[PDB]
Each structure stands twice: as C-alpha cells, then as structure tokens.
Amino acid sequence: HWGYGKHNGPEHWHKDFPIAKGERQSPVDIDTHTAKYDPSLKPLSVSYDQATSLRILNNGHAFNVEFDDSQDKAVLKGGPLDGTYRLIQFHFHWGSLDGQGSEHTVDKKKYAAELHLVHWNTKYGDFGKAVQQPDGLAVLGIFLKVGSAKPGLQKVVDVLDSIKTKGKSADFTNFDPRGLLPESLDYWTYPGSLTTPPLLECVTWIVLKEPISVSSEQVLKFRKLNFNGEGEPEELMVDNWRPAQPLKNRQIKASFK
C-alpha cells in the first residue's frame, strides 16, 4: 500500500490514485510576492472553546487526534469559507531532520513540520459526503519551527510512547487545540486537495503565516514513532510529507495587506 518510502511514496501514488496529477493538488509552494491581498475575505473565526477530543491513533502514516464531530462544537468559519466547518481531527507531517518536514513551503523554505486541523462543511451532513464535494473540507495548516517548546503540545508528545506502532490508539480526552495556535491568524488561502491518498480535490486550504515554535525534544519524540505495526521491523515514522505540487490554474490569496 501507499506510504512515503522509495517504493511506495509520493512519486508512485498516481498509479492507484490518478488524481495525483490533477488540476488542484496539494501541497504547493506559497510564493509570498505573488500572493495577493484579497479584500473580499471575511474575518476568520476559529471557535474551539467547546472542542471534545476523544482519542489519538497511529494510522501507519501519522497520528490523528480525533474529535467528537456529532454537533457544532469546534468549528471554523469566515475567511474564504461559506458556512460552518466542523473539526474532525488533527495530525502532523514532519521530517527526519529539522530542515524538512512541512508540506507547504514558503518561498521554497521548508519548515520542520506542519500541523493540519481538518474540518468538514456541515451543509453535507457527514465527512464522507463532504469528500464528494468541491467545497467539502477546510484544512487549517500551521507551520512548526524548532526553538522554544510549545506548552500546549506537550500532552500530545507525552502520549506518543503509548501509540508507537500502526494500529495503536489511546484515550485522548480533554485536549484543547487552542494551545497549538500561533498569536496571529494572518493566512494564505487557495483551493486544493488532500495531501495523502485518496488525494481528493475537496479542500479549501488556509495556511497561517506565523509558525509555532516547538522544542527539538518535542519533534524528536515525533520521530520515535513507527510506520510499522507491533512485532514488525522498525521503520521510524519520519519524512511523512508530500512535496509541493504544480500550482496550475490557481492563485494564492492573502488575508493581510
């Protein structure tokens, strides 16, 4: 099956997922000079006060922190979005070294990691129906650089030892995703896709300009996870990022002048 290695990584995905060569694939390089301020963007609203986290899962590609999305609790609205998008999960992509790991790049610069907060458009009822729609999903992307520790990340870091291998999960209630945000909500936005198979072209991307800082020790613990299952040969979960894809017939808009 698909993965990130030489034999099953991003350059192979198109064989089983031909949309990998499509017209609105993600991630992309964000050329900051060409991105244009868009006065039609409404204020962005990240409303996570009532978020209900449930569980953390190693799915063999990353780890997902899952939320109860059975009601409007944690939601994203405003900005480029029409209507209400409900938080379902977050996960990260990261590197083997601090010099790589992000999926989006900024003037070609790669960050150490990238956080994706995944939301679905409530007008479509369920995530599965949302991924049949061209405006089904909104992903809030946040870059990570290595410097000072992020206190709100430490609870995630400390549970990773309990989900080392593919298929393991752990209770992860009462986690507040507000502790993963930077100060500023300045962002870039463009229409794109999921960055892993099935690569579906459903996503409004909202990528924050301000990175969060995490410590070297925090990211080193991400890199102790395993792609493999229990009892199988150890393959460190590192470099689980897709490189930038062709921009094609798209424009990146900025929320800030």
Ligand X SMILES: OC[C@H]1O[C@@H](O)[C@H](O)[C@@H](O)[C@@H]1O
Do the strands 212-214 and 85-94 form a parallel or antiparallel pair, or are they unpaired?
unpaired
34 annotated as belonging to a binding site for a ligand: no
119: closest CA among 240, 175, 203? 203
CA distance 19 to 40: 30
Q: Closer to ligand 6YP at the Cβ: 139 or 181? A: 139
In sequence order, which residues have a C-beta less than 8 Å from that of residue 109 and are 6 or more positions away?
none
CA distance 167 to 63: 10
Least separation in angstroms between residue 101's CB and ligand 6YP is 13
Q: Closer to ligand 6YP at the Cβ: 194 or 244? A: 194
Q: Closer to ligand X at the Cβ: 71 or 251? A: 251
Among 81, 112, 139, 153, binds ligand 6YP (CB under 6 A): 139
Site string for Zn ion, 114-133 (x = CB under 5 A): --x-----------------
CA distance 99 to 239: 11
Among 195, 226, 240, 255, binds ligand 6YP (CB under 6 A): 195
Q: Does 140 bind ligand 6YP (CB under 6 A)?
A: no
93 annotated as belonging to a binding site for a ligand: yes
Q: Does 194 bind ligand 6YP (CB under 6 A)?
A: yes
Least separation in angstroms between residue 177's CB and ligand 6YP is 14
Given 12, 14, 33, 61, the catalytic residue: 61
Query: Which residue shows structure tokens 């613990």?
Result: 221
Q: Closer to ligand X at the Cβ: 70 or 249? A: 249
> Residue count at the site for ligand 6YP (CB under 6 A)?
8
Using DSSP, how many helices (H) and how many strands (E) does the chain show? 3, 15
Query: Which residue shows structure tokens 């010099």?
Result: 99
Q: Is 14 a catalytic residue?
A: no
7 annotated as belonging to a binding site for a ligand: no
Half-sphere exposure of 35 (CA within 13 A, CB side): 21
118 contacts which partner out of ligand X, Zn ion, ligand 6YP, none, CB within 5 to 8 A by kind? Answer: ligand 6YP
Among 34, 148, 216, 251, binds ligand X (CB under 6 A): 251
> Residue count at the site for Zn ion (CB under 5 A)?
1
Least separation in angstroms between residue 6's CB and ligand 6YP is 21
Query: Which residue shows structure tokens 């907060």?
Result: 117
Helix (H) or strand (E) segment spanning residue 209: none
200: closest CA among 113, 128, 249? 128
Query: Which residue shows structure tokens 């190693």?
Result: 58
Query: Which residue shows structure tokens 């601090």?
Result: 98
Q: What residue numbers does the annotated binding site for Zn(2+) cover? A: 91, 93, 116
Active site members = 61
Binding residues for ligand 6YP, rule: CB under 6 A, are 116, 118, 131, 139, 194-196, 198
